[PDB]
Fold cAMP and cAMP-inhibited cGMP 3',5'-cyclic phosphodiesterase 10A.
Amino acid sequence: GLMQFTLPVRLCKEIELFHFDIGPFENMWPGIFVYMVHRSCGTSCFELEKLCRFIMSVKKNYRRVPYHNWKHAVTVAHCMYAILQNNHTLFTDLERKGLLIACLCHDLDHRGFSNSYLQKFDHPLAALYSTSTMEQHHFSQTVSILQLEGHNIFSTLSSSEYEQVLEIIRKAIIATDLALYFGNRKQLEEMYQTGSLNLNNQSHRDRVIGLMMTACDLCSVTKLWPVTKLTANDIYAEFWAEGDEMKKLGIQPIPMMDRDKKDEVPQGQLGFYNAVAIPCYTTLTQILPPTEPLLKACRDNLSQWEKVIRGEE
Ligand SMILES: Cn1ncc(C(=O)N2CCC2)c1C(=O)Nc1ccn(CC(F)F)n1
Ligand SMILES: [Mg+2]
Ligand SMILES: [Zn+2]
């Protein structure tokens, strides 16, 4: 009951900021996550014995891939923690509980390859789940880990509170499929502009939670420039591995994924900030004004990529 996680002073302060990097010490990430749960949710949300066992099984079920790894899980949960803390009163207790767990589990058992690569490979997961393939797999893995003896962190919820939280997690994890992001954001854009947006409308909330998940998933573009730039190498290491595997199936990959076209990366970032990241944080800032620092950081990094192209680094 009376056992707080505490962090050293620098982490204790910086963790509250959107741009916090969780650092290179793996062994501190579980504690960082427990800390965020205790402050976002309370010291009672979860049995510490069970939360700890759940965290360590989730960690075990992330693989040693360059980008889609346990550090990404904890990073994406931290961005959600900063959103929730800067919008205290807008979110239910169930939503605070469910959304940090959703972020921690959102990429469970990722191999580092896109839904498209699975489909071209004819991976069994592509037959089991025709759309949002890896994302249906991540939610599946989440439910399995929740079902291990000792791992059900939700078991103190009422039956219907339980059904609601699993349904928050499922929708949240599916929304990390970027193929669905474009439509979701357009629809949120129209609702915000015509003024029909209503957060007491579950389907409207669902959409806003989906945009939050896209925002947290892409949060590498909202870091200090050196974090952003070094993460992009991890991101590209997976993309180029996928390009290699495409070439193996006898398919020329799109240039983003072709390691023979490293030159073209700074420009491919511009497309990505302009087509994806800036629109996502713009709509997010319109709907939840206190998330503006993510838009400001994203804009700073677009400008740093413009500088790379202009030879100036
Ligand atoms: C930086 N960042 N963060 C996350 C992702 C991403 O797409 N993921 C993570 C898994 C799929 C990227 C990224 O660089 N994406 C890019 C780069 C060029 N393009 C094509 C079009 F958008 F320009 N997309
Ligand atoms: Mg994913
Ligand atoms: Zn992710």
